[PDB]
Amino acid sequence: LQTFELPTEVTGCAADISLGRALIQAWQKDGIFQIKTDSEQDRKTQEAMAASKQFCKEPLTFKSSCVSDLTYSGYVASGEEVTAGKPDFPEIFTVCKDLSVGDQRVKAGWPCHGPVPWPNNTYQKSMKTFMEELGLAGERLLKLTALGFELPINTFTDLTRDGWHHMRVLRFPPQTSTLSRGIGAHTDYGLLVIAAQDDVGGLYIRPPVEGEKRNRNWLPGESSAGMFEHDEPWTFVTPTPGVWTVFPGDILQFMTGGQLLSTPHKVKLNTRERFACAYFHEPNFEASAYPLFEPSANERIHAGEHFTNMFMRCYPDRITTQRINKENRLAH
Ligand SMILES: O=C(O)CCC(=O)C(=O)O
Ligand SMILES: [Mn+2]
């Protein structure tokens, strides 16, 4: 895979435009590239992964208490069945925008808005500072992408102001310990996905395949789930120190008219447990994404509406979903 070092500030100089061209080319050929982490980005990744490992060592009663009826942030034990001798399962802690009940959007009952049920304040601090760095990387990447497409440098800036960025903090069990098979082929609904992983290995991505029609996962009727899972090609994302991976999400596919494709990906379970984090760089919850290259187009996709429906469908029995239904929160 290509690995690039990003500049700290993207200003629009010739080097920035050149880098944007190269990022687009790498996505168009490989579906993914790596970005070099600096010493602080790396340190903060390691501290977040350590906090994740410590949290997963807590008893299940405690982990299961890290839930909220206002936000989807918090813990889920994935799956619905276990057996004797296969008692383990994937675990996710989702971090969405951390808004207290003092925030006006929370007071107004906006769906998905509320405070993260942090397990402790060291996990909180570790995840917040990691997500701050991930957000800055996302902004650099979007400015470079704009420059590479000959668009204004700040094309994405209003769209992502106070963006609804969120992250899944993941633990996958060893294959022999679980009835889970990992995560099947899917795409992520976001502008960009920035991901980190430990040394165990398990992530596979599907590059662009010339002539291969792709479902447009921003449309409810074109779910990408499961598609191509058993068909070649799948690229193994070899664990590599000192990098994050980056691929386009569904929103960038929409905005670019398919010049970038949302990268399908899947996770296979290994012989050891595996830790990873997947960060989703997003528009503002209230913003609508639009075609960048079709100025006459009136079609839009509303980020907040899609986020809410996706979480409601993925976690239909969570207290968060029950409260959305009880209070008819979709009406906001
Ligand atoms: O486990 C990984 O490396 C990626 C996980 C993922 O794709 C997700 O949480 O959407
Ligand atoms: Mn994913």
Author numbering: 4 to 335
Show sentences the authors wrote.
The ethylene-forming enzyme (EFE) is an Fe(II), 2-oxoglutarate (2OG), and l-arginine (l-Arg)-dependent oxygenase that either forms ethylene and three CO2/bicarbonate from 2OG or couples the decarboxylation of 2OG to C5 hydroxylation of l-Arg. l-Arg binds with C5 toward the metal center, causing 2OG to change from monodentate to chelate metal interaction and OD1 to OD2 switch of D191 metal coordination. The best characterized EFE is that from the Pseudomonas savastanoi (formerly Pseudomonas syringae) pv phaseolicola strain PK2, for which several crystal structures have been reported. This enzyme binds mononuclear Fe(II) using three side chains (H189, D191, and H268) with three water molecules completing the six-coordinate geometry. Here, we extend our understanding of EFE catalysis by carrying out biochemical, structural, and computational studies of the enzyme in complex with a substrate analogue and using two enzyme variants. In combination, the results presented here are compatible with the currently proposed enzyme mechanism,4−8 emphasize the necessity for OD2 of D191 to coordinate the metal, and highlight the importance of the second coordination sphere and longer range interactions in promoting EFE activity.
